[PDB]
A paper describes a structure:
All three paralogues share similar structural properties as homodimeric proteins, with each subunit containing five transmembrane helices and an extended extracellular domain, which mediates the bulk of subunit interactions. A distinct feature of TTYHs is the wide hydrophobic cavity that extends from the membrane towards the extracellular environment, which is filled with lipid-like densities in all structures. Here we identify APOE as an interaction partner of the paralogue TTYH2 in endosomal compartments.
Finally, we combined the large particle population that did not contain density attributed to APOE from all the obtained datasets to generate a structure of TTYH2 at 2.7 Å. The distorted yet largely continuous lipid belt reaching from the outer leaflet of the bilayer to the hydrophobic pocket emerging from the membrane implicated that there was free diffusion of lipids between both compartments. During this process, the predominantly vertical position of lipids in the bilayer gradually changed into a horizontal orientation found in the cavity. This transition is presumably facilitated by the N-terminal helix of TTYH2 preceding the first membrane-spanning segment, which is peripherally attached to the membrane and surrounded by a lipid-like density with a horizontal orientation. The high-resolution structure illustrates how the architecture of TTYH2 might facilitate the extraction and insertion of lipids into the bilayer by providing a suitable pathway from its outer leaflet towards the extracellular environment. A role of this cavity for lipid transfer was initially proposed on the basis of the presence of lipid-like densities found in all three TTYH paralogues. Its relevance was further supported by the structure of TTYH2 at high resolution obtained in this study, which revealed continuous lipid distribution emerging from the outer membrane leaflet into the cavity, with the protein facilitating lipid reorientation.
Author numbering:
A (entry chain A), B (entry chain B): 4 to 73, 88 to 416
The structure:
């Protein structure tokens, strides 16, 4: 996030996970969220998690049957310790995933603000030029209907304004990209809020299950032991479902993060020029800005307009008592236009947008991927804890 | 960060904590890190924690004496649960404080990069203009020692180059601010890494102390119980020291975070112009820029020089077969200077620097202050856990 984006070792490893599709068919592991084969590979990872959950349940049933048909305190304490470690790791991973999601949201909002500002500046300058300059120049022409030189100067000012308007219209329009960014930010906020809440409820339920199981064991209550066995089975189901979700999300995120610029270029094509997208995506210092010529022509037109207006003031104003207010209004408009041009040349610069892109990449890849990995670790630990507790169940019942 | 800065409720609360010094005389709570009254106020905040530790030890020893002269399993399990909770909260606080410190270092490095780039642009443009433009114009004058008009054009180009150099020299120089930023970033990295390692070691020591206490209780070893009592007393002392450090650091950070712009303006009084500092600190689109006139003059001089060079090319290439290479070199130099002007006007813009400032504020205040409060909570939790463990120790020793 400081110089460039390099795919971390964990991103590379997760991307290395084979994508197999439902019927064990090799699937191309390039981020294609809209591709049926890619979605099938993610579903296959989820299905492998489901098969592992089924194996866990089968082993638990076999062990319970063998124990009933055919240490307790220490196994209970070990299960409680593993559950506490799992809940701590889950809290950490949940917070890290929330941090990554909020970093992505912040980068999307910053890019949205920059693009909306570019659009507002271009629209405001265009409206100012056309409407206000035309009105003031019409008034000045009506008051100056005696001097061919002055009329020609007004015509030159109008022509320069037209050139400025053409250049401004030649800049990218970011309305569609801004709508996409706002929609993505809203969806990310919604989904992240509900994911964080769901994992927090899972941690609370696991902690209460562990504490209630310990209390039931202390009080020697068959009702409490059976209720905690049922809750442990339900939490084992939830833990395996969570591990499936975390593994699939980690593999998809790693697929994206292994090559994010390729996906951005692929998905933006047709709505953003390749040169503009590459300018914002690579922000190479030794490179030519796609907007440099537009900005140069805009500022040259503004400079010529100001020179003409200053000459018109210093000459005509002594000759004509009136018409000074219109010239002053035009000069103020051009001063505002120069300020707007400086703001626009600052906004269209690749540095800020590339910083937003790199911050989003850092958030997603580093923070979010690590949070998803820690949530998968929590899921595995909770499965292990609620499996060992269920295994010790029958022995505790007997003794 | 995502918006402007407003002091959070916990920042306001912590800043409200009374500042009294060693003699209890009232002390101004404004952030003055170099002021003896303020440093003494922080020292008193630490001395309060030292007195609390003394009272805790007094109570522990009194209870131990009374029990020896005049529930064990459940108290031990409760102490172990509280120690696990404290270590979890401490892990969260350590991670959050590290995140805040790293965010501050990231903002400092981004501001350092921006200011260093501004300095590089200004220095390179100045050197290019004077050295290269003057050498090329001298060669052109030597090759054009026949045309008074062409000599006057070369003189005009030299005068415009001098104007550009003067305008560039009128901009702020960020060498001192950059050196201060690098020093602060390096010190922050050093202190943060060592603090994080210290708290990780403390968490691991607490965990091993609790686990070995439980193991010694299981094995019914008197030596293990005595060793765990001694290590629990040592960890209680470390926890009280950590609480004192966290409380003092949190109060100081809150004092800063209440008036960050005021502190920055005070501390940058003699090294940065007040208008420049306020421009970067407040970044209001309503107001003007302290560099707008400089940039406008720079670009107008560039445009005049470009027009002169183009006219000279057009009206002298047919007349003079030579000098074409020198004219093309000057034109390329001016093209590069236009690119540098656009880069500079994007760099000096307040948006990026204000984003860096607000991100450092978000990091420090929100993340670091929350992490410090969590570390203080961990310290109190560990003190409570080890106090309960020591209190329950005598019963196990007798049993
Ligand atoms: C939250 C974690 C992050 C990632 C989450 C997972 C991402 C994907 C989730 C669902 C996306 C919809 C998938 C539609 C296309 C599937 C691939 C495909 O259509 O290819 C098909 C998959 O087979 C199918 O039955 C069609 C698709 C069945 C979809 C089943 C939907 C289950 C939904 C449960 C998932 C719950 C969470 C997600 C809910 C939306 C391959 O054809 P075949 O081999 O089976 O035919 C073989 C024919 N012989 C044998 C004669 C040769
Ligand atoms: C056992 C532990 C498991 C924990 C993880 C799984 C728990 C659920 C997590 C998220 C569930 C989605 C949120 C509730 C469903 C709302 C749908 C609805 O109702 O339709 C709509 C559509 O929503 C959406 O825009 C987003 C579409 C959500 C569909 C995505 C399904 C796949 C999710 C994959 C999750 C990957 C990350 C997890 C990896 C750990 C909800 O209303 P709305 O959006 O139109 O209103 C507000 C309008 N805005 C959003 C603009 C403000
Ligand atoms: C984007 C910028 C990066 C993020 C900026 C936001 C927070 C930066 C760090 C704030 C906490 C620093 C804690 C220092 C504790 C030691 C104090 C000390 O002892 O020596 C400090 C000096 O050393 C520092 O302060 C380091 C300064 C670091 C900032 C350098 C300028 C940054 C802003 C540039 C201008 C643009 C405006 C901002 C937008 C970029 C003196 O203060 P004094 O009162 O104690 O002595 C009294 C002596 N007089 C009276 C002369 C002050
Ligand atoms: C908890 C999350 C719930 C969501 C899970 C959603 C799962 C997807 C639902 C639809 C899929 C479905 O119904 O299964 C459909 C497929 C059937 O295709 P086939 O194998 O190729 O059989 C036909 C054979 N042909 C097509 C070649 C002719 O399954 C399977 O037989 C997959 C068999 C391979 C299993 C390998 C698993 C190895 C596990 C290793 C553990 C370490
Ligand atoms: C044994 C599993 C226990 C865990 C269950 C967790 C909650 C499940 C649903 C609760 C919310 C709900 O109410 O479901 C609804 C939601 C959305 O779908 P929708 O109904 O069509 O909303 C739109 C249609 N509307 C508007 C008419 C309702 O579904 C989900 O996206 C939840 C997916 C849970 C995935 C967990 C494992 C994922 C494995 C992925 C491997 C590839
Ligand atoms: C600064 C560099 C230039 C940036 C230009 C703006 C790019 C906007 C990207 C819109 C993505 C989109 O379109 O939505 C995202 C799509 C929607 O899902 P989908 O429908 O299945 O995919 C569409 C497939 N189609 C087209 C075949 C139907 O995929 C995703 O959800 C994953 C989004 C990954 C996060 C990307 C954020 C990268 C950080 C950027 C911070 C500035
Ligand atoms: C063992 C019982 C559980 C212990 C729980 C507490 C400690 C957990 C690990 C701490 C060490 C650590 O933090 O590992 C650090 C790593 C990497 O991060 P890095 O340090 O910045 O990279 C440093 C790289 N070097 C060293 C080369 C410079 O983090 C992670 O990628 C997430 C680790 C969790 C992975 C769990 C797998 C989940 C799989 C499920 C989905 C497939
Ligand atoms: C998690 C880590 C976050 C960052 C923590 C960085 C701490 C060290 C940074 C500067 C170190 C330094 O400069 O130490 C040197 C400084 C001053 O220097 P002096 O030469 O002695 O001044 C001469 C002495 N006068 C000024 C009296 C004449 O000593 C101190 O002020 C000691 C008290 C500072 C502790 C609290 C200040 C910062 C609190 C945090 C508010 C955000
Ligand atoms: C306001 C209330 C605060 C409460 C106290 C909180 C901690 C304050 C920090 C002071 C830092 C300092 O004292 O200095 C840090 C010291 C001195 O470094 P040095 O020997 O000179 O370096 C050598 C010169 N080199 C750098 C060139 C090589 O480093 C140390 O080795 C001590 C580390 C102690 C770590 C464990 C803390 C023990 C605390 C015990 C309390 C019961
Ligand atoms: C084994 C068991 C492990 C348990 C681990 C527990 C981790 C808890 C993670 C939950 C995160 C969360 O709930 O949010 C943490 C919250 C939300 O802050 P925010 O959302 O980030 O932003 C700010 C959003 N406001 C503005 C709405 C708040 O912070 C806070 O309000 C700050 C309060 C800090 C309390 C610290 C204790 C104070 C008393 C001690 C003083 C010395
Ligand atoms: C009784 C068995 C308990 C086992 C507990 C093991 C904890 C040891 C952690 C070592 C990992 C490490 O080395 O660091 C700690 C790791 C990694 O942090 P990070 O993201 O990389 O920070 C980066 C900082 N840098 C950049 C400077 C490197 O944080 C975690 O994984 C979260 C663990 C949650 C707490 C787990 C237990 C909490 C309750 C325990 C009750 C039993
Ligand atoms: C992204 O920027 C757009 C503007 O381009 C914001 O859309 C405006 O939102 C405000 C506040 O809700 C409305 O009053 C305006 O009417 C909206 N304008 C348009 C053109 O839609 C949008 O809120 C921003 N999104 C995010 C997530 O920050
Ligand atoms: C802040 O930027 C300065 C440049 O202004 C960096 O200083 C350079 O560091 C490199 C790498 O160590 C050296 O080769 C250069 O000689 C340094 N230049 C100067 C002028 O000192 C500095 O490293 C940056 N600091 C941080 C923390 O990123
Ligand atoms: C540790 C985190 C960060 C990364 C994920 C680690 C695990 C789950 C991943 C990373 C790399 C993966 C391996 C990559 C390549 C292969 C070869 C293939 O023929 C069988 C699967 C196998 C052997 C994968 C198994 C799962 C694997 C070990
Ligand atoms: C992050 C988590 C979910 C990763 C889990 C990786 C699992 C799904 C991967 C790792 C190794 C993979 C196997 C590697 C090789 C083969 C042999 C091939 O002839 C059929 C597919 C099969 C049998 C793969 C199935 C999927 C597999 C088991
Ligand atoms: C995040 C924060 C809120 C964590 C907890 C901070 C607590 C300990 C702080 C915040 C505000 C503080 C109070 C602010 C003002 C006063 C009035 C004074 O005459 C006695 C102390 C007293 C009553 C302080 C006691 C400590 C206090 C309650």
């Amino acid at each position: 996030a400081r110089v460039d984006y390099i795919a971390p070792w964990w991103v590379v490893w997760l991307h290395s996970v084979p994508h197999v599709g439902l019927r064990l068919q090799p699937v191309n592991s390039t981020f294609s969220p809209g591709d049926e084969s890619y979605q099938e590979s993610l579903l296959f990872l989820g299905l492998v998690a489901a098969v592992c959950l089924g194996l866990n349940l089968i082993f638990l049933v076999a062990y319970l049957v063998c124990a009933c048909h055919c240490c307790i305190t220490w196994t209970a304490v070990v299960a409680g310790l593993i559950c506490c470690a799992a809940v701590g790791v889950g809290f950490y991973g949940n917070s890290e995933t929330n941090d990554g999601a909020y970093q992505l949201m912040y980068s999307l909002d910053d890019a949205n603000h920059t693009f909306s500002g570019i659009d507002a500046l271009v629209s405001g300058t265009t409206q100012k030029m056309k409407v206000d300059l035309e009105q003031h120049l019409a008034r000045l022409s009506e008051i100056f209907a005696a001097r061919g030189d002055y009329l020609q100067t007004l015509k030159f000012i109008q022509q320069m304004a037209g050139s400025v308007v053409v250049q401004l219209s030649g800049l990218p329009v970011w309305r569609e990209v801004t709508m996409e960014l706002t929609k993505l930010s809203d969806q990310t906020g919604y989904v992240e809020y509900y994911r964080w809440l769901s994992y927090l409820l899972l941690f609370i339920l696991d902690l209460v299950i562990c504490l209630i199981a310990c209390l039931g064991l202390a009080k020697r209550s068959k009702c409490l032991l059976a209720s905690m066995l049922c809750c442990g089975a339900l939490s084992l189901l939830l833990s395996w479902a969570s591990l499936a979700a975390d593994g699939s999300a980690a593999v998809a995120t790693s697929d994206f993060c292994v090559a994010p610029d390729t996906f951005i270029l692929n998905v933006t094509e047709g709505q953003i020029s390749t040169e503009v997208t590459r300018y914002y995506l690579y922000c190479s210092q030794s490179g030519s800005s796609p907007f440099q010529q537009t900005l140069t022509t805009f500022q040259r037109a503004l400079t010529t307009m100001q020179i003409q207006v200053a000459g018109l003031l210093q000459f005509a104003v002594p000759l004509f008592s009136t018409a000074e207010e219109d010239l002053l209004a035009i000069q103020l408009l051009l001063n505002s236009s120069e300020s707007s041009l400086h703001q626009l040349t600052a906004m269209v610069d690749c540095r800020g947008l590339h910083k937003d892109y790199l911050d989003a990449l850092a958030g997603i890849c580093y923070d979010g991927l690590q949070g998803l990995l820690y949530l998968g670790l929590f899921s595995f630990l909770a499965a292990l804890a609620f499996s060992t507790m269920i295994c010790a169940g029958p022995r505790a019942w007997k003794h």
